[PDB]
């Protein structure tokens, strides 16, 4: 299973692109210039994604996170909502709908947070698609104080579009004193993972909002061991934690429902020959594919690494400086990862979303140099 580049867009933003997410309709990215940019997925085989890119301003301090929800909930209504947090710590919402006349995207700023709520300083978010869990859509978020927020989103009151956010509840940190909640994730099962800046990760189940159980990383600090990303695999009860070692990025695999650690995703490394890790630099993000058979890690070594879940072995590697196809970790004598760093975030796009030369799953990533790239699995193209 190897991946080929389909399209890319150079200098997509005037500042760093921190996060990217996508739905069937389009791939949306956010950045430090405070602009949400939505890029139409269904792109003509020979065309520039920029011509189809629609940009919108949200906040001056810049955005550092985004997740978008798309659902055909009931009747005929195609509901698409982008949610995004800024460096200011405000949580913004934008309904996305294209114009009838020009077919261009229109953003509608939706106010869904009361005064007391909005007064908080949010950091990370994620949507919770409609499923058999409970009927309605779930939104999880974090704040600078380590507290996780769980809302239930209602797009209709009492077919009348009147969106509201019902705060199901909150789940505070395991720690005292609190620590920064860097990452959060919600599973199709109904579990909630919250990862902080010290190595601690707490897993709490949504239906009860109790805290099921939590994991604390052994590496102690002048040596930061921070959680960068947490992700629940859609298949099985698996949980994948991306975290720092000092100057390296590590992926560890735990199992939900028994709380058993199951392993770590490493690749051979030689610098002093002392030696292992997942990337020569930190892992900035993770993302499972639809089948949950392959995990993609976005490393700050300027590389995307695709690992097979069952085998716990690396499937393949992609440079973001090289366009060409043995990825031994290049580590300097001092232990510093020699590699021009590029990557900030990556996402898997389901088969059928980014259409063109449709039978293969697609991929999207955002890097340092303000460039956003798309990729496709090899089914002949």
């Amino acid at each position: 299973k190897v991946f080929i580049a389909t399209a890319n867009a150079g200098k997509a933003h005037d500042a760093d692109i921190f996060s990217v997410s996508a739905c069937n309709s389009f791939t949306v990215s956010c950045s430090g210039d405070g602009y949400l940019k939505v890029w139409d997925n269904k792109l003509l085989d020979n065309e520039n994604p920029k011509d189809k890119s629609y940009s919108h301003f949200v906040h001056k301090s810049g955005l550092h996170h985004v997740d978008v929800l798309q659902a055909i909930e009931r009747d005929a209504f195609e509901l698409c909502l982008v949610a995004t947090t800024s460096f200011s710590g405000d949580l913004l919402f934008y309904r996305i709908t294209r114009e009838d006349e020009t077919k261009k995207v229109i953003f509608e700023k939706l106010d869904l947070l009361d005064s007391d709520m909005k007064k908080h300083s949010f950091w990370a978010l994620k949507w919770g698609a409609s499923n058999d869990r409970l009927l309605s859509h779930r939104l999880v978020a974090t704040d600078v104080k380590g507290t996780t927020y769980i809302w239930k989103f209602h797009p209709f009151a009492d077919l009348n579009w009147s969106p509201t956010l019902e705060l199901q509840g909150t789940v505070e940190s395991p720690m005292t004193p609190s620590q920064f909640a860097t990452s959060v994730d919600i599973s199709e099962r109904g579990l909630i993972a919250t990862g902080f800046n010290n190595g601690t990760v707490q897993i709490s189940e949504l239906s009860t909002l109790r805290p099921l159980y939590n994991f604390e990383s052994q590496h102690s600090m002048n040596n930061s061991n921070s959680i960068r990303s947490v992700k629940f695999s859609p298949q099985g009860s698996l949980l994948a934690i991306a975290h720092d070692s000092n100057s390296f990025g590590c992926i560890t695999l735990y199992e939900t429902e028994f709380g058993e650690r199951i392993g770590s995703l490493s690749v051979p490394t030689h610098s002093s020959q002392a030696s292992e890790f997942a990337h020569s630099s930190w892992v900035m993000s993770l993302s499972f594919n639809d089948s949950g058979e392959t995990l993609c890690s976005a490393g700050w070594d300027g590389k995307l690494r695709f690992w097979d879940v069952k085998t716990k072995e690396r499937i393949t590697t992609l440079n973001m400086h090289c366009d060409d196809i043995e990825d031994i970790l290049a580590v300097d004598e001092h232990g510093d990862s020699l590699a021009e760093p590029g990557v900030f975030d990556v996402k898997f796009l389901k088969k059928g979303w980014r259409s063109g030369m449709d039978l293969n799953e697609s991929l999207c990533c955002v890097c340092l140099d303000r460039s956003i790239r798309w990729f496709r699995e090899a089914g002949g193209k």
Binding site: D16, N246, S247
Partner: protein, 319 residues
């Protein structure tokens, strides 16, 4: 560490009440106090030990006693360097050097280096007798090649200002930064050094170096000096506001570091230091509280620390 050293200091302090005049104990007291910057106590104990040593040396005066005394005087010099009265530092240091200079005893060497670091600085501060400071710092340079000492020499020779001296400093710093070449302090001091000389050619290069500081080092930079200098240089050189961007990239990396939210968003900084996520001092906490810019919190701030100008002014000006 500081706490343990403190406990050592108290321990010895109590010990002395039971039996003072124990040379070793006094030496310990000097070392710990010096570590703690408790210089006055060190001065007093140093006087008592110097007396206790001189009295004993007066009888026998075996060379080893003179060596011990030399080391002790060399200590005294540092105590004075701490106190600030550089004249006595010079005196004592020269005396210690006089006794110990040509000794060539394995332990004496450290005490010699010690004397030189005292005299050079002492002169530098004293009368700006830079030629002495130069003839001495240049000597210290030939003595060893260790990072911090190099940074010291470079700092001094550059702070002199003489056209050759600055070149000497920067050259040496660069050569170390070529030797092992990875660490911040060298790069940061070099970046500032280049920063204020305002030489456009060098700035692009050193900024290029700063941007490419490896991830490992960025962690060791808790204070986040690099993103500051990078901003200053970028903003002054490229003449673009984009020089801010870095601070974001930091906040994404170290989302719980105060120094970054200092630039980006004050409320988060204040909120981080609230419940003790980050241990912040009283003054800074006062500052953060006042930075909320409303009466109640300025009162809180001023009360927490009523001896910082900005808070008092902050309370006056709202009336």
């Amino acid at each position: 560490t500081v706490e343990k050293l403190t406990t050592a200091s108290i321990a010895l302090e109590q010990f002395f009440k039971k039996s003072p005049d124990s040379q070793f104990a006094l030496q310990c007291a000097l070392l710990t106090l010096e570590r703690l910057h408790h210089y006055e106590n060190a001065n007093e104990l140093a006087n008592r030990l110097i007396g206790i040593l001189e009295k004993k040396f007066e009888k026998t005066q075996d060379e080893r006693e003179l060596f011990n005394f030399a080391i002790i005087k060399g200590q005294f010099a540092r105590i004075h360097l701490g106190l600030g009265n550089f004249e006595l530092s010079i005196e004592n240091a020269d005396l210690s050097q006089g006794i110990i200079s040509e000794s060539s005893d394995e332990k004496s060497m450290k005490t010699k280096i010690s004397n030189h670091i005292c005299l050079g600085l002492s002169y530098f501060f004293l009368n700006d007798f830079d030629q002495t400071l130069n003839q001495f710092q240049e000597l210290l340079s030939i003595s060893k090649d260790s990072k911090h000492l190099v940074v010291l020499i470079a700092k001094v020779l550059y702070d002199v200002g003489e056209s050759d001296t600055k070149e000497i400093a920067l050259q040496e710093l660069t050569e170390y930064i070529a030797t092992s070449g990875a660490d911040l302090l060298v790069t940061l001091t070099i970046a500032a050094m280049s920063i204020l000389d305002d030489k456009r050619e060098d700035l692009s290069i050193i900024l290029e170096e700063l941007k490419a500081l490896p991830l490992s080092k960025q962690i060791i930079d808790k204070h986040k000096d690099a993103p500051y200098l990078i901003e200053e240089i970028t903003k002054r050189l490229y003449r673009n506001d984009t020089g801010k961007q870095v601070w974001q990239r930091s906040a994404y990396f170290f989302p719980n570091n105060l120094k970054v939210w200092e630039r980006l968003d004050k409320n988060i900084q204040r909120r981080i230091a609230s419940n003790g996520q980050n241990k912040v001092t009283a003054e800074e906490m006062s500052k953060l509280y006042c930075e909320s810019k409303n009466l109640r919190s300025i009162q809180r701030g001023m009360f927490l620390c009523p001896w910082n100008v900005t808070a008092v002014k902050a309370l006056n000006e709202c009336f």
